[PDB]
Design a protein around this ligand. Sequence first.
Ligand SMILES: CCCCCCCCCCCCCCCCCC(=O)OC[C@H](COP(=O)(O)OCCN)OC(=O)CCCCCCCCCCCCCCCCC
Lengths: 48, 97, 49
Amino acid sequence: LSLEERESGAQAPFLYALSLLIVFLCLAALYESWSIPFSVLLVVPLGV
Amino acid sequence: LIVALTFTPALCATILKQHDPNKEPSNNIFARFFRSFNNGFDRMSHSYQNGVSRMLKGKIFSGVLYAVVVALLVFLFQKLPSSFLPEEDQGVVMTLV
Amino acid sequence: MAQFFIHRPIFAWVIALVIMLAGILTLTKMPIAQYPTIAPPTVTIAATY
Ligand SMILES: CCCCCCCCCCCCCCCCCC(=O)OC[C@H](COP(=O)(O)OCCN)OC(=O)CCCCCCCCCCCCCCCCC
């Protein structure tokens, strides 16, 4: 597992950056706005 | 095809600016180049049209020219040799002793 | 249809961006060879007396 950990390091933050990018893009497509999506994005902390 | 149908029309609607019917030509080195180029191409088009007209009137000449063109094509097709792939220098040499 | 995206420029931008991102991601993982062809298998047997 140690070796696995060393290989798997820096995948999760990268992966979660891509997902946040795509979420922003889809929200912008929905509302047709570059600034609106950010209100929706600001909610993530509240659930966690 | 798809990009031309969707992305470029939106880009033109958003990024192109309305034309103005006003005396706003500014003589400049960057600008006058385009005016001169336009005039030259405009008269070159007339020259091309005249050449086309002379071509159309001369049926025999055009026919013989095209026939010679195809003949020269077929003559030169034989001259090139044929191979699968070219030889590329690959930066290495092997030597047998 | 052209009219749909004429009125929704942000939507068309987003589609273009997603395509480009997918392509950039793909390029970071494609194999690179000189030729498309893949050589057929060879098996070699070696014995020493
Ligand atoms: C690397 C990334 C992946 C690259 C893949 C290749 C590119 C694919 C093409 C790009 C896809 C872009 C997705 C953008 C999402 C758009 C979301 C949106 O908000 O569109 C809304 C739109 C309806 O708009 P409208 O009727 O005008 O209503 C608006 C309010 N009045 O809704 C519509 O008009 C319909 C739009 C299509 C809806 C798609 C629904 C998603 C279904 C996903 C299922 C497949 C998941 C695959 C998972 C793989 C698992 C391993």
